[PDB]
Symmetry: C10
């Protein structure tokens, strides 16, 4: 029952328990630090995303409103196409009319010239 070696087995035990307690303290410190880091990272993220989340409800209502308006633009476009077709038909009638008006202009020109000769001869005859 060796007293000197039991003494060595008290010394050694003191050293190893010192080592272990230290290792635990360092581990506790590291976990504590990671907790601080994680909480800071989370708080930074929440702070960053605040703006975009609030804006979010507003952006959704604007988009829904825009959809209704865009669909009405699509309908206006369909009506405008119908209007274009009708107006094409009016333009075709007006084109034919301008040609007939052209023929008439020439006839009216001959008439004016003849009236010129008439007024000339009246003027001679009064003179």
């Amino acid at each position: 029952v060796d007293a000197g070696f039991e003494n060595q087995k008290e010394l050694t035990k003191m050293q190893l328990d010192n080592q272990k307690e230290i290792a635990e303290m360092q581990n506790e410190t590291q976990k504590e630090i990671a907790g601080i880091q994680s909480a800071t990272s989370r708080q930074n993220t929440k702070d960053q995303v605040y703006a975009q989340n609030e804006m979010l409800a507003y952006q959704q209502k604007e988009s829904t409103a825009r959809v209704a308006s865009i669909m009405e633009n699509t309908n206006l476009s369909k009506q405008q196409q119908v209007s274009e077709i009708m107006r094409q038909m009016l333009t075709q009638a007006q084109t034919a009319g301008q040609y007939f008006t052209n023929d008439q202009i020439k006839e009216m020109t001959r008439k004016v010239s003849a009236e010129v000769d008439l007024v000339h001869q009246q003027t001679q005859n009064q003179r």
Copy 2:
């Protein structure tokens, strides 16, 4: 066995004291780093956060305006329909006008002959 246990105990109490103050320093430094991170983040998001409310009431105003454009568009669709009908009537009228133009041309021609023969006299 007491003096040697004591040489030991001083070695270990030192070791432990170094480790405590090392850990202490590590926690301090993370404290500084956290405080700096939080503060930078705040200063960064300051502007977007300050613009929030302006952007919101501007968006709401825009919603009201867009809805009024939707209403104007519906009225315009109706107007296109009214104008479609007016245009059909005007096209038929242009065709009748075409015939009138031709009769009027014959009339003008005939008036030319009668001016002519008026001019001898």
Copy 3:
């Protein structure tokens, strides 16, 4: 009071205090480095956000101005809707008018035609006399 133990307690203390003073100087170096780092990071961020913070007030009064203009656009749009409705009624009246006018055009054509016959007649009477 045995010489060995006390003299190697001396020897041991020399080492324990050298390692403690080494560790203290190390910690001091760590905290200083961290201070320099933090100050750098802060000054960086301030320098980064200067412009956006500066533009803030301008952006706000411009936004408020735009709101007033948008609301007036809304009001104008309402007035235009009323104008569209009145103009629809005018157009409807004008369409009916164009139809009545179409019939008038045909009657006038008949008239011109009859006047042509009259002019030919006058011409022929002039020739005949």
Copy 4:
């Protein structure tokens, strides 16, 4: 050698202490990693939340825009036809304007002649 058993035993105390220390350091590293992972996942979800929430709105607005764009295309085609009709009306009208230029000149001669007649009348009535 029942004696060296003792020297071995202190040594066994030393190795076991070493490994339970190492194992606790390992479990610590693992726990830290898991904290960091949960934090990173949470940050990401908080970050992508807004864009994910706008998705459906953006898609339905895009579908509305596609329909409108296609109707604009149809209108563009009708307008091309209208431009063509109108090129022809313009052609007819240019020809008419040239015939009208000749008519303007003849009508001017007529007005001139009427001036001569009115002058003669005035002269006859004055003396």
Copy 5:
């Protein structure tokens, strides 16, 4: 003899510290290098935004004055829409009275057709 334990030990202990001192000094100089670098990078990075700030501000002020004038114009356009609504109502009533006139004038043209015909028939 022991005193020379106390010389060897000192030599070891002090070499330890002088080494640690050189190492700390190195750490600090490296940090200073990195800090200076980081600060200068930031200056280089923010130069352009800072130099554009004043232009952006005065442009924003100009835009504000313009936006306010557009607001005033919109109010004037609203009043104009109102005046024009009244003109359009009056024109609609005018078109209805005109519709009746068109019908009477047609009747007149028809009767004139009969007159011209009868004048040629005799």
Copy 6:
């Protein structure tokens, strides 16, 4: 005796390795955790862009067809500008001839003034 040096040494040597083995295994598990996390973050991040891709593509295709029709319309508008240039030249010559007519018609109105006056004077 020495053989038991060769037992103590082995016990130390093998404890060394079993410790190193537990440590490597820990390293690998940590890396796997980080990798999985990183990959899943990326999936979460790219979800929306990926889900919008198809809408963006078909919208782009629609826009292309529309842009091409605008190009065709622009060509038609150019031709229209040309036709209208010719009409405008003709109208300018017409305005010059009309200018002369205006002067003659004024002379006529003046003479008619003298006629009406002389008719009232007697």
Copy 7:
């Protein structure tokens, strides 16, 4: 104790070796840091080059835009005045349209009466 001098000397060999090693490791850390610094500076300059080169262009374009914006403001004021003038023209025209409505009705009575006259003429000429 000229003997322990020897034991000291091996020890001196050991400390000096330790420090020249440490010093070379230090100079190495410094050199690495300087490489990293020059690299970071170069990257930054290469990065900001484009924006710095666009600066002057953006500024002069902004000055041009300011001048244009201010002229738009002046035009807006003139247009406000034009809207006002035109409100008044429109007012005058609305009043005119009401007087014209009464005129339209009287002219209709006249046309009607002329129809009665033409009819009577036709009747007299027919029988």
Copy 8:
């Protein structure tokens, strides 16, 4: 061949090879971890650039279409310049015409005035008879 040296050469080799095999296993762990990291980073980036690469071809034909439209806008703008020049000439002719027309307006005013006198005269002659 002395027992001490050889037996502690044995003892020493046990340690040197334990530390070499420890280091080898460590390196192996390092390289594996690095492989996993690299594969993760690559797969991440691919996953990140998928969309932009997908949109590439669409963006290119849209850009080419826009180029054709812009060039046609350029051509149209040239035609509009020519139209502006012709219309300037028409406007100049119309301005001269408005001035001649102004004088005609004044002469017509004089005429109406004279006609008023004539109508009063006719009225008075009707009363007088």
Copy 9:
């Protein structure tokens, strides 16, 4: 003194061999990291690089168009000047027309009296 120097020499040759293969591994791992960084960067800049040329010829087209807008604007300034002059002439004409409107009103009034007295007869 040879056997002990040899126990030593084996210890140190081991030490050195571990260090060589440790360094070797470090260089290998940096090789992997570099290759991964270069490859990611390439894949990242692929799209912007592929769009480069399209963006350039589109920009050039835009330059030509903008320059034509500048020319059209100059012509429009001239047109505004022509229209300014036409407008002044039209305003003077409107004033002369105003006087004519008033004479024509007096004339119409006088014609009213003469219609009246024509109606007894």
Copy 10:
């Protein structure tokens, strides 16, 4: 001249030179690695900035062109303001004219009514 201690001073020297050579090898390795990192970082940066630099010359010419166009818009705006003033004056003249036209419309209405009475009495008198 102690041979055994000179022997210790050959052993020790071998150990310390081993240590030093190793430290140098590790340093050389670390510098090599930093060289690899720096070159990769530089190549990544150049690759990244390629696009924006090329674009840069094109962006500068577009901006210069835009400046010329914006300045011409400013000039057009000044002319349009002059045009607005002239048109205000025309609108004022036209407003006065519409009022005079209003008075005339009333007079014309009285005249038409009187012509109605006249045509009525002619129709009675032919009957």
